[PDB]
Design an enzyme around this catalytic site. Structure first.
Site, PDB file in Angstrom:
ATOM      1  N   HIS A   1       0.842  -1.187   0.000  1.00 45.00           N
ATOM      2  CA  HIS A   1       0.000   0.000   0.000  1.00 45.00           C
ATOM      3  C   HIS A   1       0.886   1.248   0.000  1.00 45.00           C
ATOM      4  O   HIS A   1       1.983   1.240   0.566  1.00 45.00           O
ATOM      5  CB  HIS A   1      -0.960   0.001   1.183  1.00 45.00           C
ATOM      6  CG  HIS A   1      -2.134   0.913   1.003  1.00 45.00           C
ATOM      7  ND1 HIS A   1      -2.229   2.142   1.626  1.00 45.00           N
ATOM      8  CD2 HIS A   1      -3.259   0.782   0.261  1.00 45.00           C
ATOM      9  CE1 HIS A   1      -3.361   2.723   1.280  1.00 45.00           C
ATOM     10  NE2 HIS A   1      -4.006   1.922   0.450  1.00 45.00           N
TER      11      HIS A   1
ATOM     12  N   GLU B   1      -3.339   1.912  -7.076  1.00 42.24           N
ATOM     13  CA  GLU B   1      -3.518   3.035  -6.176  1.00 42.24           C
ATOM     14  C   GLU B   1      -2.988   4.297  -6.824  1.00 42.24           C
ATOM     15  O   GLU B   1      -1.774   4.481  -6.907  1.00 42.24           O
ATOM     16  CB  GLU B   1      -2.655   2.801  -4.949  1.00 42.24           C
ATOM     17  CG  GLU B   1      -3.375   2.596  -3.667  1.00 42.24           C
ATOM     18  CD  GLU B   1      -2.417   2.706  -2.510  1.00 42.24           C
ATOM     19  OE1 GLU B   1      -2.509   3.712  -1.770  1.00 42.24           O
ATOM     20  OE2 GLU B   1      -1.554   1.803  -2.381  1.00 42.24           O
TER      21      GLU B   1
END
Length: 233
Positions: free
Chosen positions: A81, A153
């Site tokens: 992430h 992302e």
């Protein structure tokens, strides 16, 4: 046609959130995931009972830690992430190693890739993003992709003052899938879930999901998540 979509929420009252999830009838086929931090794990575990949900760990990189999670009944994990990369210093290779370790330890892995504002602005979305997943691929064998989910992302859209159009998300997802198709195989690319991992709400989620290469979401653990789930059709 699309593979099974995933709606995943990354870690408001958590207890109230879980209540809401538990009470939510989800009619369509969608794998829901709640990724928790270590501390909220046992609680999410005992409270979240909706059978279309699984719990995910995040960022575990230690074999023993992975083994313990698996023993605890946690079979999914989110890795790579944005903040792990841009803040904690997890390089493409470190993320790749964690993905490979988690796969070897029996996990389903949501592996996040994504470029920064400066990388997107300078036209380097492709080389950055594909280099990130190439690093992941290098540590995996073909069969492992059955256990891999990619989350794209748009780091570039987070706290930067920029927004992510369905066109932009589709472009990003398409280039990832095209790379997977070329480098790993079209069979893998066909089954691969690629989730949009940028800030998303009910409305824009439903629109994003309509894109060819979008297979769901990695979003915020918030009451709106129910709308994100419903958006995956």
């Amino acid at each position: 046609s699309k593979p099974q979509p995933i709606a995943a929420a990354n870690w408001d009252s958590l207890s109230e959130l879980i209540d809401l999830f538990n009470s939510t009838s989800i009619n369509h086929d969608v794998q829901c995931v709640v990724a928790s931090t270590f501390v909220h794990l046992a609680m999410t575990k005992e409270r979240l009972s909706h059978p279309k949900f699984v719990i995910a760990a995040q960022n575990a990189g230690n074999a023993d830690a992975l083994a313990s999670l698996k023993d605890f009944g946690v079979n999914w994990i989110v890795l790579g992430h944005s903040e792990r990369r841009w803040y904690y210093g997890e390089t493409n290779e470190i993320v790749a190693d964690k993905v490979a370790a988690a796969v070897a330890s029996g996990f389903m892995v949501i592996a996040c890739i994504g470029e920064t504002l400066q990388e997107r602005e300078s036209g380097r979305t492709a080389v950055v993003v594909l280099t990130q997943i190439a690093a992941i691929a290098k540590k995996l064998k073909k069969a492992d992709w059955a256990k891999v989910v990619i989350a794209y992302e748009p780091v570039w859209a987070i706290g930067t003052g920029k927004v992510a159009t369905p066109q932009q998300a589709q472009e990003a997802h398409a280039l990832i899938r095209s790379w997977v198709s070329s480098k790993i195989g079209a069979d893998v690319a066909g089954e691969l879930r690629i989730l949009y991992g940028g800030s998303v709400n009910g409305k824009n989620a439903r629109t994003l999901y309509q894109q060819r290469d979008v297979n769901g979401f990695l979003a915020g653990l918030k009451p709106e998540f129910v709308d994100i789930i419903k958006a995956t059709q």
